[PDB]
UniProtKB/Swiss-Prot annotation, chains A, B:
Domain TIR residues, every copy: 6-117
Subunit composition and interactions: Homodimer. Also forms heterodimers with MYD88. May interact with PIK3AP1. Interacts with TLR4 and IRAK2 via their respective TIR domains. Interacts with BMX and TBK1. Interacts with EIF2AK2. Does not interact with IRAK1, nor TLR9. Interacts with TLR2. Interacts with RAGE/AGER. (Microbial infection) In case of infection, interacts with B.melitensis protein TcpB (AC Q8YF53); TcpB abolishes the TLR4-TIRAP interaction and downstream signaling.
Keywords: Cell membrane, Cytoplasm, Disulfide bond, Immunity, Inflammatory response, Innate immunity, Membrane, Phosphoprotein, Ubl conjugation
Subcellular location: Cytoplasm; Cell membrane; Membrane
Gene transcribed to yield this protein: TIRAP
Signal peptide stretch: none
Gene source species: Homo sapiens
Name of this protein: Toll/interleukin-1 receptor domain-containing adapter protein
A cellular component term, taken from the record's GO annotations: extrinsic component of cytoplasmic side of plasma membrane
Part of the full-length chain shown: 79 to 221 of 221
């Protein structure tokens, strides 16, 4: 529960087709929030899933999404799904009973994503 | 890890539109395997997800699917996805990196599902 139990405060999960949008989010989050793009050995307090059409199509992305929700946001974790570039009708059904940020919100949803991240950090020692 | 730590050996997860197919599976599993249809207070060793078009469309089904994979099949659990009545092209992408039974297999996939259930039970005291 210690703020320093992890070296990063948040990492962004994205598919290869959204590399630039991910970098913008990382840049937006760090303006202090220490962020980076998620990687294999990546371990942070919060994980932002940049869910886009490309992401939803990629099997590995979906798998990472699953595990990101398996051991995390049950209550003790922090996983923030950002639905971007998608029609709400194409949103993953399971989201109706889960927290997530809509890309149509202010700042492409970045503002609410950052806010959600900060809220979690405060609950840390 | 005790075979009697749970009152049921397996329960079937289905959407309202597949009630009959679920009952057939339950019936098939018990011919000893103690099975039933999954319910809110339901707790068993294995959980069979009867994934069909209706299931994939229903938000609550998907959510239950998620949680069924969140705390389960990481290694210590038992969750068996049965893809039935669907074109493989419409299968959830995350399945490419996970175990699952195809409905096109022998006995509508029931045989392999039962086998998978038994395998898990043996690993129990």
């Amino acid at each position: 529960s210690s703020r320093w139990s992890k070296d990063y405060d948040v990492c962004v999960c994205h598919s290869e087709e959204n590399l630039v949008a991910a970098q913008d989010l990382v840049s937006y989050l760090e303006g202090a929030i220490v962020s980076e793009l998620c990687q294999a050995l990546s371990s942070s307090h919060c994980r932002v899933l940049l869910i886009t059409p490309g992401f939803l199509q990629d099997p590995w992305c979906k798998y990472q999404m699953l595990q990101a929700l398996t051991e995390a946001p049950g209550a003790e974790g922090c996983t923030i799904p950002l639905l971007s570039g998608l029609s709400r009708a194409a949103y993953p059904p399971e989201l109706r009973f889960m927290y997530y940020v809509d890309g149509r919100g202010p700042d492409g949803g970045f503002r609410q994503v950052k806010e959600a991240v900060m809220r979690y950090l405060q609950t840390l020692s």
